[model samples]
Target: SNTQTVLPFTGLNTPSGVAVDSAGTVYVTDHGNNRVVKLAAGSNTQTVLPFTGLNTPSGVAVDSAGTVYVTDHGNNRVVKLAAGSNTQTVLPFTGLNTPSGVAVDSAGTVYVTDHGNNRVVKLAAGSNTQTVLPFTGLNTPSGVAVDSAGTVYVTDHGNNRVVKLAAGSNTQTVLPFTGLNTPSGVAVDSAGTVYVTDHGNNRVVKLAAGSNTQTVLPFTGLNTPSGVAVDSAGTVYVTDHGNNRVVKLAA
Candidate 1:
């Protein structure tokens, strides 16, 4: 089957990351425009979020509380925006080197990929401090997402594979999979199925939970796809960076 359009070439500039809130509102990080845009559910029109502190925003994610988290790549920090207000606050944490991807867990814990530093860090809910997860052998980790069971999945860009960190331990292991060429973005669905953008290969692949096999979604003719996200209804969104549009797949 072919992919269908959810957004029809709306005026986006170098869009990078995508995330959807529980209410079906879509948030996109317009990397080239240096701002995030929020699209109401079932609407094509968008309102550029009024937070002006963004600089080369790369990744965008929304928590259960509707708060938005963005990794400002050019600024080397992450900013937290309240759910329904324009007020913003920069997370008070050190040692971020071009954070690229971000995700929040059910407990409000934030996880991000320090791409330049080759590490993953966690900011616990209601805490000002951050703890670097035990996975130190990362190679240019680009995109990251956490599953319902708290397992962390990261796209190891340099290694061309996705690595997983167990829920309760620091043990990091590469999933037994192949056929990825410079995989960039990653997201896990409600059923623990992993979805990744095979950037260099110009396609997206899904790995079913507890299986070592690979199933490439029937997407074709993509150009330098970068970020990906899955909504509550199992629909998939891919950022076609080179083409400057987002492709939405039916669940």
Candidate 2:
């Protein structure tokens, strides 16, 4: 598993975040161009979120129902597109304030990071209303993810730490400013390994499920690493922002 596979950058304009669904469809948020691009399993790049009119897209997530959700930074809202349709709409924009990151749980609940408002909001499946997190303390939370146990994890960029919220509890900084510099995006794998994008530090960090031990995938010549995702085989994909490309590391 130590061996790595190199994917040639197929010309992406500032890819900000990337995620892969169960079907192996790779979705990447093309920040500079304000759109989401999809690369089919073993195929080349194509614009799947081509629903059109997205402004400054950043984070992307797929639900159990195969629905795709992405945060439109420019519009300050999260958009939902049905599984097999190419149409999209701003979901609950009435409450979202600068939505920056998004992640959907197995049950289809959507978790989003409201950067301008310094909070994380969870929208119940099939509902437009939301429940805000930190319910107390949060500062510019950027990326968010939900583990199988329903525990929520969010990266507070302003604090340079990752916070974890128990199933239905308030937020707690599980991994504090411990060597992190502007942590932007986060994702949890099937095995519960937490992968975080250290933007200012230019690296991807691996954190044990609920432990403090860490392993860093550094020196891949990354610049401003932002969002991350792990595939079924444990292959890690990270969006190297400053480099305008996606980097992959094997388990």
Candidate 3:
């Protein structure tokens, strides 16, 4: 399994975003079919997540306790599916507009990209209300990620740049990257290396944690590759929306 040069493609319909739990299990949003699917750790195939009536689910995240959260994009709300139970509930936050991405921190705080509002919002642990992060000039922040350090990363799709918000700071700075074409999804590794899906370019690019160089991963024939995820072990996963498959790269 983990030793494979590259794993086989896991097929789905119009997948939007992907997430991997600390245990190596992977989850993805099946945007076309209105469901979220997963490949259990070391399992070769995917199965549904006991969720139904999902209206165009777009983003997904798995917390340390195994809780699952997804942006019910078409429903204009976020949904939480308990780790072991089949029960699901709509998160209580309001004023979400086409929420497209979800990410959770080590402390249980959740971050989401409200695409239609061109902003990012967060749900602090145990709070039903959300506070919009102080990000200025966010243009269609289609993807959001919170690293272990609590630093926030957003894909400013309309601006073709990635904005970085250091923990506890309201000021934001764009990462030193240019030429991004409608970047849609983003993920940050423990070392601060950032991975993003350059949607319009049909490729995935990496901002090295150790270097200043921007490198495009050598994933070929990646048509409309969208969401990107990095596991605790540093393995990479991506939703190939155009190809209807989630591609995995060995750590």
Candidate 4:
């Protein structure tokens, strides 16, 4: 069958963020409802997390150890939630303002997009040591992802482009607005292919790493696509914000 199963939402209002772990456990951020929802791995769904006191949850990312990092948009900060545990807290408040997206590298480095601050920040594995990207002219950067080599990619929503920040250099932006149209979310596959959700265009775009060419998604149907993630075997997952559902496709 060309159709896949659609997981039902647990009465979550304004589900703005979603992330899946290596084991397939799903984590979602309900912004309007002010909470995060954890769905059982590759199944229907359940409310594994609740809004104990988070301001506004926007985006989420899971670490190798299952530690989940969530962007508290209202609080202009990020929070850390231990894997399989409910403990949470606002983390590394330094160099952050209206943080919208979070990504963790294999080495445990954390990267976030400061939407209100117009910058990208990197935090060392264990401490609050911070480094701000030289994204001096980013137009409201939002979505973010990290590749296997530690390279960071961000969706500059306002600028209608996806940016790549070199691991440890002030000089970045390896990819720009070649075919992006108000790209809201981005993800990279192991083969170095970058996928972006073109919010304005109502489709997904893919770019071969280290190149400027792009390919659009199948022109069947897509609506207000926002967040994106790619799996180990190159499966693509996109969050259709307007449709209020997550769609998966084979690469």
Where in model 1 is the C-alpha error above 4 Å?
none
Error of 4 at 145 (Å): 0.8
Write the residue-wise lDDT of candidate 3 on 1-251 in tens digits.
Answer: 23323344355788999999878888899999899988887677678898756899999999999889999999889988888877897887789999999999999999999999998999988898899999999888889999888999999999999998998897998887768999999999988899999999998888976566898876767888789999877788888889888887766
Candidate 2 per-residue lDDT over residues 25-138, each given as its tens digit: 778888888778787777754655655788888899987677889999888788878777867867874567778899888787888899889888888886867887654567
- lDDT per residue, candidate 1, 8-32, as tens digits? 5378888989998888888889999
Error of 3 at 204 (Å): 0.7
- The per-prediction CA RMSD against the true structure, in angstroms, equals 1.3, 1.8, 2.1, 2.2
Query: Where does candidate 4 clash, by residue pair?
Result: none
Error of 3 at 78 (Å): 0.3
Q: What is the alpha-carbon lDDT for the whole of candidate 2?
A: 0.80
**TM-score of every candidate:** 0.96, 0.93, 0.94, 0.90
**Would you give me the overall lDDT of model 4?**
0.77
Which ten residues in a row are the worst by lDDT in model 2?
A: 1-10
lDDT values for all models: 0.87, 0.80, 0.87, 0.77
Kindly report which residue stretches of model 2 are placed more than 4 angstroms away from their true locations once superposed: 1-9
